[PDB]
Symmetry: C3
Subunit: 189 residues, 3 copies
Amino acid sequence: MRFILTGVPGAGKTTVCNKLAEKMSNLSVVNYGDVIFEEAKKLYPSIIQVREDTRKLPRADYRNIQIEAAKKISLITDNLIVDTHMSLKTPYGFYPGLIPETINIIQPDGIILLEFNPRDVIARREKDRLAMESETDILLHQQVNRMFAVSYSAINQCYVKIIDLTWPQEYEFQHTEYAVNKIIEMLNF
Amino acid sequence: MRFILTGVPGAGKTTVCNKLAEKMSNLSVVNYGDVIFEEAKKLYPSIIQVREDTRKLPRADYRNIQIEAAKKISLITDNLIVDTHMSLKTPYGFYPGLIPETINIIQPDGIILLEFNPRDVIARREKDRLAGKRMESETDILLHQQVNRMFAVSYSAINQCYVKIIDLTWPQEYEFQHTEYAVNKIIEMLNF
Amino acid sequence: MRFILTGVPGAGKTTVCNKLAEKMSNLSVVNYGDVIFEEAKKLYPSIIQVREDTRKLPRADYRNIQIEAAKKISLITDNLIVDTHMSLKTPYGFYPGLIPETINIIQPDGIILLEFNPRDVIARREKDRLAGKRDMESETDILLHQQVNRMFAVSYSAINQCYVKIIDLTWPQEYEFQHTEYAVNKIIEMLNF
Ligand SMILES: Cc1cn([C@H]2C[C@H](O)[C@@H](COP(=O)(O)OP(=O)(O)OP(=O)(O)O)O2)c(=O)[nH]c1=O
Ligand SMILES: Cc1cn([C@H]2C[C@H](O)[C@@H](COP(=O)(O)OP(=O)(O)OP(=O)(O)O)O2)c(=O)[nH]c1=O
Ligand SMILES: Cc1cn([C@H]2C[C@H](O)[C@@H](COP(=O)(O)OP(=O)(O)OP(=O)(O)O)O2)c(=O)[nH]c1=O
């Protein structure tokens, strides 16, 4: 099966991927961003250095890089988790991390949303910082990602699975276990 | 005028249809699932003889049955209200209760949403379970209705159709006052 | 750049449009309803004479009007701000203000949603209902309308890969027109990036 895992940044969406890769073999977890970056570095070596450098690219060249990366990912032949973002905040607004080409090429069985509590995201981004959105911004962002998922579902006829993590953690990294277990229950169902 | 009446199941969405049919001769109320049935058992009487059996069809046959149902419906000259679901909860998440085709074939003027209060929904589902006619919580129902709103808005943006939301969240003086309100609102919509 | 500015009616959407068109250069602000009305008036002068005569037409003729408006609108400049409505409440339920064509013809960089607090909107509408410019919506009606505008914008973004910027003007003002100055600064900051 093919599922696209999404969530707001700085919340634990990478943690679930690490723990899914660990706890389940026969499962290929892939970061769409890393594949796009590698394809870009290969196609534009003399100018692409770090991840941010992908903003230098023209619109159409970047779209082609996305298409190529989706082509690469479509080759994975067993259980697949595609790690990416539905929306990314820009000074110009929320921008889709996906494109219809990705949905058509990868042919994902479904999308998964990881919804958290704003307070959690705040503390989490603080931890990642030591090594500026408000709770309102984060609620807005999550509702926006939800609308994006419902739109992509209405266009491509795919599932949208919302995993709730608003509840308080008795111990740190409880959200991770819950999400990983739900996703594995979903894969073996 | 043709509309797609929808809402979470177990809340009164069929009562509205039946009452509407009682209360308006200039109208035809049809349930998409029931037409899917009639047209499937017309072709596969061997393995399809009860509703819950439709799971057995491959996606090819079942999609063709959906297309044939929407086509048979589209032959209704008079006002039309198509009862169906926007999204169905599954172990894989929500899935659209409509395929783009349906919408194209029917050419619905709009989509009507019936938004209930979650407790009503659960209470109704319990009472309907005890009558031999059948676990979600209030949060799950709120989420389902919100996702239904989002599906209606997406379909409108894609196909250019109205999105009429009917509020049945208020407390009822007497049982089945929600159906009275919804029926009257829809008729008002038609006779304008 | 090209942006489509929207928000519930009677809340301060043309205010921001005017403050923009004046406080910026190379910036052309244009209202979609006005171009629609002008083109319809030209094509059907016999019956188009008030902004409500426009919907005495079949939706196909009106759709052609909308496509012409868009075409006509894009031609105006290489920079733009299109004042329009994401959705409009009607006896049959919220109807889209744009069409998949509008955005293919104008190729807008993004959509902007000015999201207000409904209480402010009620007050503004009834202050407009005293100055001659203006209808009985409530707080919940308006919250639903704004949520529906949000959903429409996100849908169109998913469809055409455009930004959806949301400007929060729900907070209470320290003085009149603080919301408008805030929004104008946000949009300018965005453009001068
Ligand atoms: C699940 C969880 C994460 N965290 C911390 C660990 C992480 O360092 C931080 C952010 O989670 P990340 O694992 O970094 O999630 P991400 O997808 O946003 O990362 P990336 O920038 O690469 O896209 O949150 C907690 O403090 N408590 C928790 O319960
Ligand atoms: C409208 C209404 C229904 N009820 C009861 C009648 C039924 O037992 C149940 C309503 O369920 P139904 O009216 O039968 O609707 P449904 O769940 O079958 O819809 P769908 O097509 O999606 O499957 O609740 C009330 O008690 N009060 C009410 O106001
Ligand atoms: C921003 C703002 C507007 N107002 C008033 C001024 C106007 O009467 C009204 C602002 O709304 P409009 O500027 O008229 O915005 P609009 O184009 O969306 O409305 P319409 O469809 O009617 O053309 O509210 C205030 O009183 N304080 C404020 O801070």
